Amino acid sequence: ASIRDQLHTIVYRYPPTYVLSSEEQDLVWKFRFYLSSHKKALTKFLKCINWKLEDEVTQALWMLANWAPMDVEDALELLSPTFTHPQVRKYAVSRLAQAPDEDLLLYLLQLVQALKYEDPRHIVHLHGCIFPANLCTFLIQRACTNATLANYFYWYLSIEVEEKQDERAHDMYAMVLKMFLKVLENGNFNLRGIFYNLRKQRRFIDELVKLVKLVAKEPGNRNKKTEKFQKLLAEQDMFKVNFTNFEPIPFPLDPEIYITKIVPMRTSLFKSALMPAKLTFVTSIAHHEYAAIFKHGDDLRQDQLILQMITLMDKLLRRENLDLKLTPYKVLATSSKHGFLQYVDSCTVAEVLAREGNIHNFFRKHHPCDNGPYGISAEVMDTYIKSCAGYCVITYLLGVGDRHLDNLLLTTNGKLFHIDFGYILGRDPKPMPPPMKLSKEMVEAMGGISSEHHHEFRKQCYTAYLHLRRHANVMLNLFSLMVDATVPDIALEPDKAVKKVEENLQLGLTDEEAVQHLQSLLDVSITAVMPALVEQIHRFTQYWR
Amino acid sequence: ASIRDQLHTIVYRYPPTYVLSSEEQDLVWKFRFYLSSHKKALTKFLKCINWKLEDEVTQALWMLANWAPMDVEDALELLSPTFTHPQVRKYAVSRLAQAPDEDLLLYLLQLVQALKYEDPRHIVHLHGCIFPEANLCTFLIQRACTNATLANYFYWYLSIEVEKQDERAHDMYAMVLKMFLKVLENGNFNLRGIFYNLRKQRRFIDELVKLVKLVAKEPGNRNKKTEKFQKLLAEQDMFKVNFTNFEPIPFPLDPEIYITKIVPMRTSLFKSALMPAKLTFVTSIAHHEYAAIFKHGDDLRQDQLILQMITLMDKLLRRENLDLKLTPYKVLATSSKHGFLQYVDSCTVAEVLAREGNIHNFFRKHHPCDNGPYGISAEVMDTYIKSCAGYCVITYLLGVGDRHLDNLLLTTNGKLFHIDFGYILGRDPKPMPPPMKLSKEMVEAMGGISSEHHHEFRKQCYTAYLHLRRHANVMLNLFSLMVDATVPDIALEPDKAVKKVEENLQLGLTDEEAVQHLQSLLDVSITAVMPALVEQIHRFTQYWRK
Ligand SMILES: CC(=O)/N=c1/[nH]c(C)c(-c2ccc(Cl)c(S(=O)(=O)NCCO)c2)s1
Numbered sequence A: 001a002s003i004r005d006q007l008h009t010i011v012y013r014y015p016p017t018y019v020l021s022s023e024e025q026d027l028v029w030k031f032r033f034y035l036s037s038h039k040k041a042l043t044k045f046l047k048c049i050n051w052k053l054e055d056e057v058t059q060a061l062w063m064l065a066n067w068a069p070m071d072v073e074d075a076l077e078l079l080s081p082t083f084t085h086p087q088v089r090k091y092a093v094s095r096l097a098q099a100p101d102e103d104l105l106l107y108l109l110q111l112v113q114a115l116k117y118e119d120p121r122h123i124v125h126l127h128g129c130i131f132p133a134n135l136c137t138f139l140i141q142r143a144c145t146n147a148t149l150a151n152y153f154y155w156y157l158s159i160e161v162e163e164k165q166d167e168r169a170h171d172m173y174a175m176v177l178k179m180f181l182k183v184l185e186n187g188n189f190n191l192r193g194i195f196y197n198l199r200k201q202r203r204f205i206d207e208l209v210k211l212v213k214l215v216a217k218e219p220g221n222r223n224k225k226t227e228k229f230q231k232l233l234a235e236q237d238m239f240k241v242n243f244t245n246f247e248p249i250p251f252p253l254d255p256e257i258y259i260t261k262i263v264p265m266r267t268s269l270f271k272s273a274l275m276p277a278k279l280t281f282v283t284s285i286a287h288h289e290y291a292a293i294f295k296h297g298d299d300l301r302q303d304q305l306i307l308q309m310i311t312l313m314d315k316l317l318r319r320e321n322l323d324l325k326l327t328p329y330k331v332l333a334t335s336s337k338h339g340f341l342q343y344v345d346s347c348t349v350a351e352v353l354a355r356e357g358n359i360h361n362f363f364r365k366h367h368p369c370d371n372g373p374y375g376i377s378a379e380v381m382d383t384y385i386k387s388c389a390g391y392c393v394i395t396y397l398l399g400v401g402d403r404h405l406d407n408l409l410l411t412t413n414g415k416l417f418h419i420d421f422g423y424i425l426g427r428d429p430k431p432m433p434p435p436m437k438l439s440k441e442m443v444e445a446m447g448g449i450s451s452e453h454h455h456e457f458r459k460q461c462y463t464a465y466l467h468l469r470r471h472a473n474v475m476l477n478l479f480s481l482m483v484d485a486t487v488p489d490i491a492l493e494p495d496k497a498v499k500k501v502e503e504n505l506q507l508g509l510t511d512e513e514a515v516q517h518l519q520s521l522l523d524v525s526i527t528a529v530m531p532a533l534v535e536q537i538h539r540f541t542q543y544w545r
Numbered sequence B: 001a002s003i004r005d006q007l008h009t010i011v012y013r014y015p016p017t018y019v020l021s022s023e024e025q026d027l028v029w030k031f032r033f034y035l036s037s038h039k040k041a042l043t044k045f046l047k048c049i050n051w052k053l054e055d056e057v058t059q060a061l062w063m064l065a066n067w068a069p070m071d072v073e074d075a076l077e078l079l080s081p082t083f084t085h086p087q088v089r090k091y092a093v094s095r096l097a098q099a100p101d102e103d104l105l106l107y108l109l110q111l112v113q114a115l116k117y118e119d120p121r122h123i124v125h126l127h128g129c130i131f132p133e134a135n136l137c138t139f140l141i142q143r144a145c146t147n148a149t150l151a152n153y154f155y156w157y158l159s160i161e162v163e164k165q166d167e168r169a170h171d172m173y174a175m176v177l178k179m180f181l182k183v184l185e186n187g188n189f190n191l192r193g194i195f196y197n198l199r200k201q202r203r204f205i206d207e208l209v210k211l212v213k214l215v216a217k218e219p220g221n222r223n224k225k226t227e228k229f230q231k232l233l234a235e236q237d238m239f240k241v242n243f244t245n246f247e248p249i250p251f252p253l254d255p256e257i258y259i260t261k262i263v264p265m266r267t268s269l270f271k272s273a274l275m276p277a278k279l280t281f282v283t284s285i286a287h288h289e290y291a292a293i294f295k296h297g298d299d300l301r302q303d304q305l306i307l308q309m310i311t312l313m314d315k316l317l318r319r320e321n322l323d324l325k326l327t328p329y330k331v332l333a334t335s336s337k338h339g340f341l342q343y344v345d346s347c348t349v350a351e352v353l354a355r356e357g358n359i360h361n362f363f364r365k366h367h368p369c370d371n372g373p374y375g376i377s378a379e380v381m382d383t384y385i386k387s388c389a390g391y392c393v394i395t396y397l398l399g400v401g402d403r404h405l406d407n408l409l410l411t412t413n414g415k416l417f418h419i420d421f422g423y424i425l426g427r428d429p430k431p432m433p434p435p436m437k438l439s440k441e442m443v444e445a446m447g448g449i450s451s452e453h454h455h456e457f458r459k460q461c462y463t464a465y466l467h468l469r470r471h472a473n474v475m476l477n478l479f480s481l482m483v484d485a486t487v488p489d490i491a492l493e494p495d496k497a498v499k500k501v502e503e504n505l506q507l508g509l510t511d512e513e514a515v516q517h518l519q520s521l522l523d524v525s526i527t528a529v530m531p532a533l534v535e536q537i538h539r540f541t542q543y544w545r546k
């Protein structure tokens, strides 16, 4: 038949979390031998057979080895806690190895979570071998090959190692890190090198933290505190590291860039309540400054997960040839309670309005074109619309709550981005989120409800939503892996978190239905936002008396 | 060939009238000549060439004469004021000749309008032909005499037109009626029969007009006026025509039915200030009784156009097989300020809501089923949903205004329909009309926005819309012929009227987009109507403030 081919298509090439496939799976089995169309199919096949029969397992194992090779994302699904079997786990690891380093890095965070699911005895044995294949051996081998990987891997392990089930995973992660440092210490010249560099980073942060704690103890309003901060950095050999000069250190935030000194005067502290510094650094090359922020008191693991998410979505959209000019900025955590964040030069939307009446005035000031469209250079408008679309959709998919003018920022080229992703998957302090988050001023920024640009924005949202809908599996698989993740919003209900993103993605609906649905959310949110729209609705209510 | 075809196929199918692509028109020519396969192409083809000079015009007629024959609708487009040329009008009329009588019956209003479009010389020649001293007017006459129902309608449309460039058009209309009547008198027996029938009808109408004038005269309250009315009916010789019995006349509002007499005891009178009367008539056969309304206040030319449009749309939908179970009651205007309306048994919603707290109760009273989706039988519920769907869509395209709960009535059966059309094409006494018209109570009748019936209802509107979009052209041509019509609402911005319906049609949108647009309109209308949805909006507005 031909109908048969299509019912199968819905099943192998639609949803990954679905345990849905039920008996149809048995039907899948028959075609399975004749045609394993694709990799997507392999992931689906694996789900149905395993537990019941040893002989059935033998046939499946042979089937998997023969099978057309799976794509990496599916590999993540395999590393998931759902699949117990060692051979499938090994196969999943083989898939990862084949993948290029940069892609391997993007996932890395999940791979560390994945570590929890890999059997403990592999890890105890490996330890046994080092003191008086399996994935953890794989992560260490790969981590050693590449310095940047070594660096993130080290930072992720260390975040886990500091102070019920916490005990089992902590001992195990601790085991992993000790092994990693010991492999580097022995390794050769390049590995020894990696080890020294980390030693340096660790030392630098500790002193940086010490200085920060002194600043907090010292009393004053922010400015008095900041002046004090400037003074400490300039103070030579109060600290183990001298902040005005040091030996070059690959930035922990970015491993690629060494730093030299810090400039005491260029350091500010932020308006936000928990006060984080901007710092500047010089860099090893040509003296170029870098800045990052550094944050005194918060666990950023949540922020890093969301940013990875935004980075990933952006990568996917870009291959599709959609650039929404999203800015994913680097975060890392250090310890829980400190990290860095990349600094983007921007003005907070609230600052822009306070300081320039409206967004347009501010853009116009930076990029005047007499000729169009708002007396603002066309490209800036374009980037602003695109950033807006990218963010509504991503904020919506990732269920990001708690946005405000302090929260959004702008750039001088136009882009908008978000910040401070403390509320995730629809947690909001408030009782009633709008489903889509657009400030009145942002809508006005587009020249109101009826403008060419507003239409461009909605068109753009639908397209972006549709593309993400298509590339579901990867995000769902990364979330599947973040169940026991120690990200607070996920921690409230582990299970519901994966389900929530799936619900937002709206995979059930047909494409025409999904666009209509999205349109509906945008519309309620925008009507609520505009006052003219609200008075007009009152008028319609009134019309029936 | 390959890529040039798609743009061809788009232009023939997609726009109803286009200024655009004048260079495109000249581009089509080269490949127009050759394809010449399908008729809808022909319509677009004629448009370009005539502004273009004369020697190509004669070539185009050979092209025209040969081209695959048009469907009737495209021809109403050619009778347009837009195309002046005489040979095409022959072609258009030959096209009309082909139409079965029922189709001509539908387009009649528009055809009488098409008379306003020249040539006067055609009328005067025919006048000179029957007086002391095929082609359009002749066609209409010859056609009218062929069939009696056709003749009736033709008479009443002519009749109303005759009762600084308007006077000359009036005068022309007058000649056409007198000719039509003289043809009937000189007629073989059947014509004479039709003629005698028309006379009977008028004599009758005028006696009833007098009677109404006498009932209107009294200062006494409405209840006192009904009583007076009944008495005027019960006494014969009061009028040249006696109302308690007369020789069977074919009902003027519906030609087929014959009426013996009005029944006086059953006569009732309506609430509106200008005070309409409801009359029961006796049919000639089997003592069937037919109810009608006769209205003394205003010309129903507006109301009748709308009902034509509704009937038209219904037919299209049902031809795509969408019984949205509309109820297009018949309307005829006798003259400006008197009319007849098919009465259909109905309870106004406002009435239904006082009589019953809710619409569900009402429906439940008339068709219970314990297993029913609600207390109600499933068929009633489905029909109600459909009727709503049809009516929102139609109201939206038509920019019908003034809807209130007295304006829309409900049948025991469940069909919902709107009755009154004072305000049209977005004219509304009120300043900000909802784009879609739903009573809050109508939505509740669907079981609310989460309820599935509501979802089905919405699905129904979208498809109704999609289909109607497809037969865009027939409506457009009709309205283009109604430009000089004398409906008050067209008259204020007569040129702009057609454009207003065209905006409602959103022809520019692709189908997915169209639906989206309509969805937006539904949404606003419903949210305004529901107090819970406004509350939600209210909390949302609260979010950004602080
Ligand atoms: C002027 C300016 O604020 N430039 C910045 N570019 C970026 C990426 C900033 C940033 C990123 C993350 C965080 Cl967590 C912060 S924060 O100011 O430390 N917390 C804000 C809570 O409302 C600030 S701030």
Ligand SMILES: CC(=O)/N=c1/[nH]c(C)c(-c2ccc(Cl)c(S(=O)(=O)NCCO)c2)s1
Residues within 6 Å of the ligand: B270, B272, B273, B276, B293, B295, B329, B341, B342, B343, B344, B345, B346, B347, B348, B409, B419, B420
């Ligand atoms: C109201 C009722 O019970 N049955 C009816 N069925 C029909 C088609 C009605 C109708 C149609 C057109 C008009 Cl114009 C009217 S009307 O009641 O005469 N005009 C309303 C306010 O002045 C009533 S009324």
